[PDB]
Design an enzyme around this catalytic site. Sequence first.
Site, PDB file in Angstrom:
ATOM      1  N   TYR A 211       6.674  -8.446  -5.913  1.00 50.79           N
ATOM      2  CA  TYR A 211       7.231  -7.907  -4.685  1.00 50.79           C
ATOM      3  C   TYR A 211       7.876  -8.978  -3.827  1.00 50.79           C
ATOM      4  O   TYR A 211       7.611 -10.173  -3.973  1.00 50.79           O
ATOM      5  CB  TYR A 211       6.151  -7.173  -3.873  1.00 50.79           C
ATOM      6  CG  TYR A 211       5.144  -8.106  -3.255  1.00 50.79           C
ATOM      7  CD1 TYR A 211       5.267  -8.514  -1.927  1.00 50.79           C
ATOM      8  CD2 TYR A 211       4.076  -8.597  -3.994  1.00 50.79           C
ATOM      9  CE1 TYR A 211       4.346  -9.385  -1.347  1.00 50.79           C
ATOM     10  CE2 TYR A 211       3.154  -9.458  -3.424  1.00 50.79           C
ATOM     11  CZ  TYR A 211       3.296  -9.850  -2.107  1.00 50.79           C
ATOM     12  OH  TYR A 211       2.356 -10.717  -1.577  1.00 50.79           O
TER      13      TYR A 211
ATOM     14  N   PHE B  88       9.202 -12.515   4.560  1.00 51.83           N
ATOM     15  CA  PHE B  88       7.907 -12.926   5.083  1.00 51.83           C
ATOM     16  C   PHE B  88       6.914 -13.089   3.944  1.00 51.83           C
ATOM     17  O   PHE B  88       5.850 -13.693   4.142  1.00 51.83           O
ATOM     18  CB  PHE B  88       7.363 -11.929   6.124  1.00 51.83           C
ATOM     19  CG  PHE B  88       7.102 -10.543   5.580  1.00 51.83           C
ATOM     20  CD1 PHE B  88       5.896 -10.230   4.983  1.00 51.83           C
ATOM     21  CD2 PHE B  88       8.057  -9.556   5.683  1.00 51.83           C
ATOM     22  CE1 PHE B  88       5.660  -8.971   4.486  1.00 51.83           C
ATOM     23  CE2 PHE B  88       7.827  -8.294   5.191  1.00 51.83           C
ATOM     24  CZ  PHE B  88       6.630  -7.999   4.586  1.00 51.83           C
ATOM     25  N   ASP B  89       7.222 -12.549   2.757  1.00 48.42           N
ATOM     26  CA  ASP B  89       6.260 -12.658   1.647  1.00 48.42           C
ATOM     27  C   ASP B  89       6.989 -12.436   0.339  1.00 48.42           C
ATOM     28  O   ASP B  89       8.049 -11.799   0.321  1.00 48.42           O
ATOM     29  CB  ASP B  89       5.114 -11.642   1.832  1.00 48.42           C
ATOM     30  CG  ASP B  89       3.885 -11.938   0.972  1.00 48.42           C
ATOM     31  OD1 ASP B  89       3.818 -13.024   0.355  1.00 48.42           O
ATOM     32  OD2 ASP B  89       2.982 -11.070   0.937  1.00 48.42           O
TER      33      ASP B  89
ATOM     34  N   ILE C  71      -1.842  -2.822   2.578  1.00 50.32           N
ATOM     35  CA  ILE C  71      -1.495  -1.932   3.673  1.00 50.32           C
ATOM     36  C   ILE C  71      -1.386  -0.500   3.177  1.00 50.32           C
ATOM     37  O   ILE C  71      -1.141  -0.247   1.990  1.00 50.32           O
ATOM     38  CB  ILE C  71      -0.183  -2.352   4.358  1.00 50.32           C
ATOM     39  CG1 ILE C  71       0.963  -2.417   3.347  1.00 50.32           C
ATOM     40  CG2 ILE C  71      -0.344  -3.690   5.070  1.00 50.32           C
ATOM     41  CD1 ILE C  71       2.326  -2.620   3.993  1.00 50.32           C
TER      42      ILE C  71
ATOM     43  N   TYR D  88       0.833  -3.556   9.324  1.00 52.82           N
ATOM     44  CA  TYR D  88      -0.122  -4.376  10.070  1.00 52.82           C
ATOM     45  C   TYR D  88      -0.233  -4.036  11.553  1.00 52.82           C
ATOM     46  O   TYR D  88      -0.953  -4.721  12.282  1.00 52.82           O
ATOM     47  CB  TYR D  88       0.203  -5.864   9.891  1.00 52.82           C
ATOM     48  CG  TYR D  88      -0.128  -6.347   8.503  1.00 52.82           C
ATOM     49  CD1 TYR D  88      -1.430  -6.692   8.163  1.00 52.82           C
ATOM     50  CD2 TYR D  88       0.844  -6.437   7.515  1.00 52.82           C
ATOM     51  CE1 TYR D  88      -1.753  -7.122   6.887  1.00 52.82           C
ATOM     52  CE2 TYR D  88       0.517  -6.873   6.223  1.00 52.82           C
ATOM     53  CZ  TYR D  88      -0.785  -7.207   5.928  1.00 52.82           C
ATOM     54  OH  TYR D  88      -1.155  -7.638   4.665  1.00 52.82           O
TER      55      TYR D  88
ATOM     56  N   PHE E 263      10.035  -3.728   1.898  1.00 54.38           N
ATOM     57  CA  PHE E 263       9.597  -4.287   0.623  1.00 54.38           C
ATOM     58  C   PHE E 263      10.501  -3.895  -0.541  1.00 54.38           C
ATOM     59  O   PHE E 263      11.088  -2.810  -0.552  1.00 54.38           O
ATOM     60  CB  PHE E 263       8.183  -3.823   0.272  1.00 54.38           C
ATOM     61  CG  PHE E 263       7.104  -4.412   1.116  1.00 54.38           C
ATOM     62  CD1 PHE E 263       6.571  -5.645   0.790  1.00 54.38           C
ATOM     63  CD2 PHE E 263       6.577  -3.717   2.193  1.00 54.38           C
ATOM     64  CE1 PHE E 263       5.543  -6.186   1.540  1.00 54.38           C
ATOM     65  CE2 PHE E 263       5.554  -4.265   2.947  1.00 54.38           C
ATOM     66  CZ  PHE E 263       5.037  -5.489   2.618  1.00 54.38           C
TER      67      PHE E 263
END
Length: 122
Positions: free
Chosen positions: A39, A49-50, A69, A95, A112
Amino acid sequence: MEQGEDITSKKDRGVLKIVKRVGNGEETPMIGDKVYVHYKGKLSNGKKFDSSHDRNEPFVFSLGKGQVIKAWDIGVATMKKGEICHLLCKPEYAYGSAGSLPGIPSNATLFFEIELLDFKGE
């Protein structure tokens, strides 16, 4: 025309899905299955961010157990093996007001890209 599918139970458009690559067959993972994903997540500003690829390692979790999440527990349950989707996640399904700081601000919508690599029974 790629329109987001609202996959929330409340149908509040809090989690929107678009399939980018169709997976294999019709089977989807069940609650409790161990799932393996790659991902990438971006904030509204388009910055990552990830990313599991940036760590060079697939991410593994048990589906439906709150290890991710809410948007993911909902969304990955709809994916076929090999599927790539985009998933838009309002903060109430992500979040929330806490964020996950410093990388994920409070009250942030998350965007995502997810590939379901595999899954297996518990």
